[PDB]
């Protein structure tokens, strides 16, 4: 809702900041195995528990 | 089987009495020096309706003998009491309606209300609408007083016990039929969660001793012993007799 607590707002901020694809230069490092962001979350797919 | 409704009622929870609209308990003044030795004068400010109580209450203001403040009490209103009336409480108070006197200073044959079982308890007996306690007799050497209760019982209380001269207001409240489930509901909605009441024979055996069966029947004697276990006391507890009362009863 528009009414939010500071804690809830902060956690939403953290989720928004984590919602991104991985950097491209990561895949160029030696020994890299990360192909894509496996913890990607979408507001329509997976509900975050507050 | 289950825990039956009568057993559940003692837990509290949803069966606790409603108290929001009740402003103060109906009690006499604390028994003090003025009431013990002489009298004290109070002024009736209002006659109020107390939800859940058939009888009206009287708000009476007194002066503090020891401080500049003034003290408002809540008495059970005796019928005939009115706003702006002076009432007097004490040993030497006059014998008029609404005055609070010890039973020692009251002649035999007068009716009182909110009679104390023991002096200083601020009233226990005959506090319901249309009810009163009769002063049957005195025993000054023993310092006691025989009284007759609304139920017809005879009791002996110390003569120092106090009572309000007259009869509790509220008249014959039970003289008119409730006539409607809604009116019964409104009556009990400010008292308790006890209405409506389902019959035990309409239940299942898991729910009540009267249980089920292919016909609605108790199936065993409904009179239950005085020393039956909790959960068994459903029906007529310790009934001396049953059936229609067809004459006068020796007990009283």
């Amino acid at each position: 809702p528009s009414h939010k607590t500071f804690r809830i707002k902060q956690k939403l901020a953290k989720a928004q900041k984590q919602n991104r694809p991985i950097p491209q230069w990561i895949r160029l490092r030696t020994g890299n195995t990360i192909r894509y962001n496996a913890k990607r979350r979408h507001w329509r797919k997976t509900r975050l528990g507050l | 089987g289950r825990v039956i409704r009568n057993q559940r009622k003692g837990r509290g929870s949803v069966f606790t009495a409603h108290t929001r609209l009740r402003k103060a308990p109906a009690k006499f003044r604390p028994l003090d020096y003025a009431e013990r030795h002489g009298y004290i004068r109070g002024i009736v400010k209002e006659i109020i309706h107390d939800p859940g109580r058939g009888a009206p209450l009287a708000r009476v203001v007194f002066r503090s003998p020891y401080k500049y403040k003034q003290i408002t009490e809540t008495f059970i209103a005796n019928e005939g009491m009115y706003t702006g009336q002076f009432i007097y409480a004490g040993k030497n108070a006059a014998l008029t309606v609404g005055n609070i006197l010890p039973l020692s200073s009251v002649p035999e044959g007068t009716v009182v209300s909110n009679v104390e079982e023991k002096p200083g308890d601020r009233g226990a007996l005959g506090r319901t609408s249309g009810n009163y306690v009769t002063v049957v007799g005195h025993n000054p050497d023993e310092g006691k007083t025989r009284i007759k209760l609304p139920s017809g019982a005879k009791k002996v209380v110390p003569s120092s016990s106090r009572g309000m001269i007259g009869i509790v207001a509220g008249g014959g409240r039970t003289d008119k039929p409730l006539l409607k489930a809604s009116r019964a509901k409104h009556k009990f909605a400010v008292k308790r969660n006890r209405w409506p009441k389902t019959r035990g024979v309409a239940m299942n055996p898991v729910d009540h001793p009267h249980g089920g069966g292919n016909h609605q029947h108790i199936g065993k004697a409904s009179t239950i012993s005085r020393y039956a276990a909790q959960g068994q006391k459903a029906g007529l507890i310790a009934a001396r007799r049953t059936g229609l009362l067809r004459g006068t009863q020796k007990t009283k």
Binding site: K9, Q10, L12, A13, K14, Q16, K17 | -
Partner: protein, 52 residues
């Protein structure tokens, strides 16, 4: 707001008439500090803030 005003005064010799604040969805605080009418925000930004 008091800390922001004092910090601006100490760090840039900037005097403000009022400061509004919000917290952005990214979690950081954004402050709109209105300067006094006698000081020009364009010159302040050009000379001290590197903004053009």
């Amino acid at each position: 707001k008091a800390q922001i005003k004092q910090a601006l005064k100490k760090l840039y010799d900037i005097d403000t008439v009022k400061i509004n604040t919000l917290i952005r969805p990214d979690g950081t605080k954004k402050a709109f500090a209105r300067l006094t009418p006698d000081v020009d925000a364009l010159d302040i930004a050009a000379t001290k803030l590197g903004l053009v």
